[PDB]
Amino acid sequence: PPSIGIAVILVGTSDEVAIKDAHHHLSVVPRVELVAMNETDPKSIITRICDLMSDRKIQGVVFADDTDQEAIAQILDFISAQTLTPILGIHGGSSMIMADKDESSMFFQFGPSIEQQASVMLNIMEEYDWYIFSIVTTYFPGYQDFVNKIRSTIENSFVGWELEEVLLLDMSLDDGDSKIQNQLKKLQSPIILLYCTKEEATYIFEVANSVGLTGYGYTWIVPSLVAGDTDTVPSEFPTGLISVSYDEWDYGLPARVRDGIAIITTAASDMLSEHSFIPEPKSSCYNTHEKRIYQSNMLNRYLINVTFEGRDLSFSEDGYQMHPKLVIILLNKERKWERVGKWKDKSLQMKYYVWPRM
Amino acid sequence: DPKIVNIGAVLSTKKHEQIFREAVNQANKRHFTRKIQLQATSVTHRPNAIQMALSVCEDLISSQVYAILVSHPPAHLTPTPISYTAGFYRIPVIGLTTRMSIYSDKSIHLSFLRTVPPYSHQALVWFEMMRLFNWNHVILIVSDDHEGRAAQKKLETLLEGGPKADKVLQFEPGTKNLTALLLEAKELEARVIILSASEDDATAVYKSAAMLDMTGAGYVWLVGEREISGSALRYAPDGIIGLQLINGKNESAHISDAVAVVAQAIHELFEMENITDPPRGCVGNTNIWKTGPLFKRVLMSSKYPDGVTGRIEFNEDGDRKFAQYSIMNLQNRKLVQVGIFNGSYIIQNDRKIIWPGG
Numbered sequence: 001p002p003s004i005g006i007a008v009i010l011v012g013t014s015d016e017v018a019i020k021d022a023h024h025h026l027s028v029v030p031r032v033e034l035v036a037m038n039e040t041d042p043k044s045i046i047t048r049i050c051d052l053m054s055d056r057k058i059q060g061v062v063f064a065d066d067t068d069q070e071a072i073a074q075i076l077d078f079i080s081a082q083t084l085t086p087i088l089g090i091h092g093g094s095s096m097i098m099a100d101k102d103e104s105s106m107f108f109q110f111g112p113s114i115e116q117q118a119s120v121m122l123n124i125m126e127e128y129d130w131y132i133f134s135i136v137t138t139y140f141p142g143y144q145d146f147v148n149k150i151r152s153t154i155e156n157s158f159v160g161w162e163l164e165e166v167l168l169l170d171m172s173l174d175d176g177d178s179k180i181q182n183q184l185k186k187l188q189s190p191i192i193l194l195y196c197t198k199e200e201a202t203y204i205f206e207v208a209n210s211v212g213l214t215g216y217g218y219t220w221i222v223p224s225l226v227a228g229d230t231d232t233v234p235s236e237f238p239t240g241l242i243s244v245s246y247d248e249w250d251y252g253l254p255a256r257v258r259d260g261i262a263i264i265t266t267a268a269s270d271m272l273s274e275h276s277f278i279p280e281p282k283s284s285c286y287n288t289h290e291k292r293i294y295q296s297n298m299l300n301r302y303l304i305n306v307t308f309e310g311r312d313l314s315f316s317e318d319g320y321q322m323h324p325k326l327v328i329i330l331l332n333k334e335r336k337w338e339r340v341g342k343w344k345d346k347s348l349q350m351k352y353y354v355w356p357r358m
Numbered sequence: 359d360p361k362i363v364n365i366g367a368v369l370s371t372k373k374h375e376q377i378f379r380e381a382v383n384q385a386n387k388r389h390f391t392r393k394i395q396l397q398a399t400s401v402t403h404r405p406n407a408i409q410m411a412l413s414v415c416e417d418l419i420s421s422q423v424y425a426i427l428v429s430h431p432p433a434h435l436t437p438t439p440i441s442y443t444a445g446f447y448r449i450p451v452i453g454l455t456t457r458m459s460i461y462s463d464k465s466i467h468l469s470f471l472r473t474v475p476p477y478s479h480q481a482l483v484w485f486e487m488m489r490l491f492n493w494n495h496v497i498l499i500v501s502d503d504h505e506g507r508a509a510q511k512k513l514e515t516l517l518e519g520g521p522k523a524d525k526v527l528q529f530e531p532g533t534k535n536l537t538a539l540l541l542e543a544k545e546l547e548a549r550v551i552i553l554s555a556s557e558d559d560a561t562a563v564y565k566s567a568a569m570l571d572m573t574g575a576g577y578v579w580l581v582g583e584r585e586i587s588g589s590a591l592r593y594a595p596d597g598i599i600g601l602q603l604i605n606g607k608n609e610s611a612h613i614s615d616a617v618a619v620v621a622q623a624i625h626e627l628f629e630m631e632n633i634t635d636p637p638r639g640c641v642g643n644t645n646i647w648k649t650g651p652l653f654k655r656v657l658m659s660s661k662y663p664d665g666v667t668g669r670i671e672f673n674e675d676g677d678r679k680f681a682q683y684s685i686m687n688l689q690n691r692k693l694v695q696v697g698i699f700n701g702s703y704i705i706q707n708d709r710k711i712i713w714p715g716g
């Protein structure tokens with residue numbers, strides 16, 4: 001069987017040996033090379049992947065980082081779309097949900113859709129009869145998909161939901177006019193759903209605290225990307241913060257790099273065993289204006305429908321994992337993120353029946 | 359020795375690079391430049407998006423540019439990679455000639471103003487014509503893409519602010535047999551038809567409308583700039599009214615005004631306290647420019663009345679206000695100017711309008 005080149009890119013300290021040791025009967029076999037990378041600015045990420053693609057024949061990329069940088073996902077989608085190369089963001093910033101990927105991206109992310117986390121958050125509220133709430137977002141892509149999902153869910157519900165306020169915070173401008181404070185002051189609800197980036201949340205919580213919305217009587221629920229790396233907990237995050245989370249309790253990096261390589265390899269085998277060809281690895285990034293009509297996102301049908309070793313590793317067409325096991329976590333009195341629920345098979349299994357405090 | 363503050367530019371030709379230099383030199387002559395003094399740093403569009411993004415890092419952000427002017431090239435290459443890469447750092451981008459409405463989306467383009475309006479803003483002119491010529495009932499046909507729906511959104515806002523839209527019809531971009539859609543329009547009483555469509559799509563509409571005898575007397579056709587350009591012009595019914603953005607394609611003019619605005623804004627920025635520099639280069643830098651969002655506010659509030667393309671202000675999206683349009687009328691198959699929208703007022707000239715039929 002012929003070999004396809006798969007680059008695995010690891011940003012930040014990594015048990016490269018735990019990863020290699022942790023990992024194919026198909027029509028094609030992986031030749032995996034671990035690149036390590038120290039920086040996650042656009043230039044560093046672009047040049048590194050472009051150099052790989054030219055100093056070697058790369059069928060696909062598996063990407064993992066240890067940052068809280070959702071921009072990495074944006075960058076990877078762009079790179080993927082431009083070079084029509086499959087990139088899997090399996091951990092860290094690379095995995096933080098990017099809404100509205102390019103039409104011709106081949107970029108897939110380990111972690112929950114925006115719509116899925118929205119529904120998980122309503123399930124949490126239903127469990128504890130928290131029927132009265134407001135939403136706060138920034139303009140961070142997804143924010144509409146988030147608000148819509150909520151609205152759509154609760155307008156179709158026999159339950160007595162009361163969505164009091166939706167706030168849209170513009171943090172592309174400075175806050176010298178104390179504008180965002182004045183918006184936050186308008187919140188009355190006891191539950192608050194917040195959609196934004198980790199770095200944005202940091203600031204919003206600082207302000208929210210200053211006008212007395214972080215204490216008892218207010219509960220905030222945020223999505224994975226706000227919590228991000230749970231070993232890193234901004235000081236401004238309020239105790240009693242609830243988050244959905246796919247950050248790597250039961251599904252460890254080694255096992256993901258395993259599946260990433262599996263997904264890409266299988267996908268290629270499936271295409272070859274039906275079309276008698278796979279897409280030729282791109283010679284470079286610097287000749288993609290020329291080779292346009294010769295390239296395709298054909299390989300996507302297969303990438304999103306891989307079953308390997310008993311697990312359905314399917315993606316959505318929107319580019320996220322289909323059936324992730326999600327952990328619900330709570331930021332406790334010791335400023336440590338604590339596991340208080342699971343979300344498994346569309347059922348929510350919470351720890352507490354009544355929430356404790358202190 | 360003053361402090362040297364770089365402005366950046368990505369421009370079509372080296373003639374325009376030289377115009378940008380001379381514009382910045384003039385600003386330095388015109389302003390009090392003992393404390394701060396500007397320096398022009400520029401570059402022409404690269405042949406593809408990934409190369410362009412890199413160039414922004416290597417050539418521009420490496421010089422710590424406070425802002426970046428961008429034009430629409432002559433040959434598939436958009437400002438988008440410049441907006442992304444600059445946006446990563448919250449360095450503002452000033453679009454000179456880009457007119458697609460998508461650039462008004464804050465989620466996709468954080469730090470993007472422009473000195474020309476999006477196409478959707480042609481609704482402003484339509485609306486003032488509808489008041490003027492007392493068209494109180496209109497049909498509105500629009501392409502079902504971002505741009506088409508942008509025009510609908512914008513017109514409808516002005517109507518739900520009196521004239522009304524009796525119906526709104528959307529067609530799939532790329533369709534040629536629009537007889538189905540236009541028959542639906544034929545059956546309504548309103549005989550004033552407003553069209554938002556690309557060149558090729560407007561051609562399809564124009565042909566189908568002619569077969570159905572909807573281009574004759576009775577009917578008023580009111581379109582924008584794209585719909586009387588190139589191949590659209592070549593089938594457009596006689597009597598049609600359309601628009602051309604005055605100086606809309608004078609890169610040189612918009613460089614002159616852009617630099618004036620940006621220069622003003624820089625000096626206004628440095629009246630304020632605790633101004634930080636942008637990051638020197640991309641490599642190793644992943645934090646936003648702390649002062650970026652403040653500088654964006656300053657730019658947004660920038661008023662430059664005595665500008666070459668008229669009165670420069672920006673709306674809440676950073677799109678140009680007070681743009682000026684030629685009101686064009688197809689007469690015996692020649693495009694003839696019958697008036698201008700001067701920013702706020704319709705000024706009919708002495709050349710008589712000839713409607714379809716008459």
Ligand SMILES: *[C@@H]1O[C@H](CO)[C@@H](O[C@@H]2O[C@H](CO)[C@@H](O[C@@H]3O[C@H](CO[C@H]4O[C@H](CO)[C@@H](O)[C@H](O)[C@@H]4O)[C@@H](O)[C@H](O[C@H]4O[C@H](CO)[C@@H](O)[C@H](O)[C@@H]4O)[C@@H]3O)[C@H](O)[C@H]2NC(C)=O)[C@H](O)[C@H]1NC(C)=O
Pocket residue numbers: 668669700701702703
């Ligand atoms: C696009 O076109 C519009 C309309 O022509 C321009 O807007 C007008 O700008 C002119 C200046 O050139 C303004 O003229 C001034 O009007 C003042 C009174 O305005 C009131 O009344 C008018 C008419 O009823 C209303 O439209 C308006 O809303 C006000 O209620 C006068 O007092 C001014 O006189 C001054 O100048 C003369 C010299 O000519 C002196 O002798 C006087 O002492 C005095 O100082 C002047 O005549 C007019 O008001 C504006 N109209 C509107 C509707 O705003 C735009 O400027 C133009 N845009 C561009 C970019 O060119």
Ligand SMILES: CC(C)N(CCc1ccc(Cl)c(Cl)c1)C[C@H](O)COc1ccc(NS(C)(=O)=O)cc1
Pocket residue numbers: 042071074075078138139140141169170171172173411442443445446464465466467468
């Ligand atoms: C959506 C696009 C695709 N995306 C592209 C980014 C990108 C792409 C490729 C490269 Cl190469 C690089 Cl470098 C960057 C834009 C960027 O993600 C904007 O994200 C924002 C928007 C709003 C907010 N909140 S707000 C407006 O309140 O401040 C925050 C962050």
Ligand SMILES: *[C@@H]1O[C@H](CO)[C@@H](O)[C@H](O)[C@H]1NC(C)=O
Pocket residue numbers: 036037038
């Ligand atoms: C990253 O840093 C390590 C040392 O911590 C170094 O050995 C390695 O060469 C660096 N990698 C790059 C791509 O600079």
Ligand SMILES: *[C@@H]1O[C@H](CO)[C@@H](O)[C@H](O)[C@H]1NC(C)=O
Pocket residue numbers: 305306307
């Ligand atoms: C592809 O998806 C189909 C569902 O139509 C299903 O048979 C399976 O999940 C996939 N087929 C494979 C992996 O052979």
Ligand SMILES: *[C@@H]1O[C@H](CO)[C@@H](O)[C@H](O)[C@H]1NC(C)=O
Pocket residue numbers: 608610611612614666
């Ligand atoms: C473009 O604008 C400049 C002024 O900045 C002017 O000299 C030139 O004549 C204009 N060109 C056209 C075609 O109007």
Ligand SMILES: *[C@@H]1O[C@H](CO)[C@@H](O)[C@H](O)[C@H]1NC(C)=O
Pocket residue numbers: 631632633
């Ligand atoms: C910026 O503010 C800090 C905090 O007071 C101060 O130490 C510093 O001198 C200020 N710099 C300027 C240029 O005002």
Ligand SMILES: [Cl-]
Pocket residue numbers: 036037038039044
């Ligand atoms: Cl590196």
Ligand SMILES: [Cl-]
Pocket residue numbers: 077078081082102
């Ligand atoms: Cl893209």
Ligand SMILES: [Cl-]
Pocket residue numbers: 095096097111112223224225
């Ligand atoms: Cl996420």
Ligand SMILES: [Cl-]
Pocket residue numbers: 068069070197198199200
């Ligand atoms: Cl962040």
Ligand SMILES: [Cl-]
Pocket residue numbers: 043415416420639640641
């Ligand atoms: Cl650099």
Ligand SMILES: [Cl-]
Pocket residue numbers: 696697706707708709710711
């Ligand atoms: Cl006239």
Ligand code: NA
Pocket residue numbers: 461462463467468469470471472675676677
């Ligand atoms: Na804008």
